[PDB]
């Protein structure tokens, strides 16, 4: 299915550096078209996100579409295998869907025949002007194996690091995930942030989902009882139980590799 996504910049905790750089990447061509003439800038054709898994790459690709009132078409790495006109049939359906975001997910896998399902993507890329109104976003957890041809000028213009959330970003992920839940006043997410060092956004969302299931499973069983003879809330004790089921999903060793990779490019 092809639609305009529903997630907004507001559903994303942290990453505010990336957020304002993404906005001006798409807002500048349309808010000052009258200065993109004078000096002769050809607008951005694409970006590439890299970093640990479950830290917001897919959400910023949807949020970019929601901001541009664009359709979103999401194709996932291994399903490109049967088979080269696949790379031409998804591109035509995105051209058909303009204005559109084409999202290439999980193809660190492709980076190890498969040889030129890459080159068919690079040739499809170079043969699609900015005038078609398609914006390509790619994502990977293996930044050590990008073939640097996809980042040559004319293709995926920028490479952006989407890292594990620091203490201040965990408070914002928790707040953004519960923005529309009735959470009890005794709940302190600042304290929940200090206790979740190394947790990804995915991990933080899970903890939010378990406390939610408990607070309403408790709701059904109680007035099922108090009918034998007013909104309920998620409380501090629902979050306590929900944390026995809680530990990180990204290892310390792989956290060092990402930190080494991002840091060497300043
Ligand atoms: N920065 C964030 N703010 C709020 N929720 C997040 C954040 N990062 C991850 N999540 C949660 O984890 C889920 C998976 O994230 P996703 O963006 O698909 O990760 P990636 O694409 O980096 O593998 C999201 O749907 C969301 O529930
Ligand atoms: N060792 C090894 C490879 C591995 O399994 N994962 C991995 C590879 C690169 C980065 Cl930058 C992060 C994690
Ligand atoms: Na991932």
Swiss-Prot record:
Spans through the membrane: none
N6-succinyllysine modifications at: 185
UniProt effect for mutating residue 57 to Q: Impairs ERAD degradation of HMGCR
Effect of residue 106 to Q: Does not inhibit interaction with RHBDD1. Increased interaction with CAV1 and UBXN6. Impaired autophagic function. Defect in ubiquitin-dependent protein degradation by the proteasome
Modifications made to the protein after synthesis: Phosphorylated by tyrosine kinases in response to T-cell antigen receptor activation. Phosphorylated in mitotic cells. ISGylated.
Superkingdom, taxonomy of origin: Eukaryota
Residues annotated to bind ATP 2: 54-59
Coiled-coil regions listed: none
Modification type Phosphoserine: residues: 219
Subcellular location: Cytoplasm, Cytosol; Endoplasmic reticulum; Nucleus; Cytoplasm, Stress granule
Residues bearing the modification N6-acetyllysine: 35, 38, 185, 257
Function as written in the Swiss-Prot or TrEMBL entry: Necessary for the fragmentation of Golgi stacks during mitosis and for their reassembly after mitosis. Involved in the formation of the transitional endoplasmic reticulum (tER). The transfer of membranes from the endoplasmic reticulum to the Golgi apparatus occurs via 50-70 nm transition vesicles which derive from part-rough, part-smooth transitional elements of the endoplasmic reticulum (tER). Vesicle budding from the tER is an ATP-dependent process.
Involvement in disease: Inclusion body myopathy with early-onset Paget disease with or without frontotemporal dementia 1: An autosomal dominant disease characterized by disabling muscle weakness clinically resembling to limb girdle muscular dystrophy, osteolytic bone lesions consistent with Paget disease, and premature frontotemporal dementia. Clinical features show incomplete penetrance.
Similarity remark: Belongs to the AAA ATPase family.
Subunit text: Homohexamer. Forms a ring-shaped particle of 12.5 nm diameter, that displays 6-fold radial symmetry. Part of a ternary complex containing STX5A, NSFL1C and VCP. NSFL1C forms a homotrimer that binds to one end of a VCP homohexamer. The complex binds to membranes enriched in phosphatidylethanolamine-containing lipids and promotes Golgi membrane fusion. Binds to a heterodimer of NPLOC4 and UFD1, binding to this heterodimer inhibits Golgi-membrane fusion. Interaction with VCIP135 leads to dissociation of the complex via ATP hydrolysis by VCP.
Comment on protein domains: The PIM (PUB-interaction motif) motif mediates interaction with the PUB domain of RNF31.
Protein name: Transitional endoplasmic reticulum ATPase
Organism lineage string: Eukaryota, Metazoa, Chordata, Craniata, Vertebrata
């Amino acid at each position: 299915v092809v639609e305009v996504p529903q997630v907004t910049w507001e559903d994303i905790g942290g990453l505010e550096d990336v957020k304002r750089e993404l906005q001006e990447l798409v807002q500048y061509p349309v808010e000052h078209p009258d200065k993109f003439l004078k000096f002769g800038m050809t607008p951005s054709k694409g970006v590439l996100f890299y970093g640990p898994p479950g830290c917001g790459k897919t959400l910023l690709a949807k949020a970019i579409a929601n901001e541009c009132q664009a359709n979103f078409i999401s194709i996932k790495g291994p399903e490109l295998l049967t088979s080269e006109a696949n790379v031409r049939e998804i591109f035509d359906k995105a051209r058909q869907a303009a204005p559109c975001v084409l999202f290439f997910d999980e193809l660190d896998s492709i980076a190890k025949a498969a040889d030129r399902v890459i080159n068919q993507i690079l040739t499809e890329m170079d043969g699609m002007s900015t005038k078609k109104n398609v914006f390509i976003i790619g994502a990977t957890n293996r930044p050590d194996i990008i073939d640097p041809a996809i980042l040559r000028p004319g293709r995926l213009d920028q490479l952006i690091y989407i890292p594990l959330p620091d203490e201040k970003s965990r408070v914002a992920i928790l707040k953004a995930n519960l923005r529309k839940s009735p959470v009890a006043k005794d709940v302190d997410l600042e304290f929940l942030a200090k206790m979740t060092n190394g947790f990804s956004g995915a991990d933080l969302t899970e903890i939010c989902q378990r406390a939610c299931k408990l607070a309403i499973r408790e709701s059904i069983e109680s007035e099922i009882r108090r009918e034998r003879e007013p909104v309920p809330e998620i409380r501090r004790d629902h979050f306590e139980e929900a944390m026995r089921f809680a530990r990180r999903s990204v290892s310390d060793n792989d956290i060092r590799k990402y930190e080494m990779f991002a840091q060497t490019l300043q």
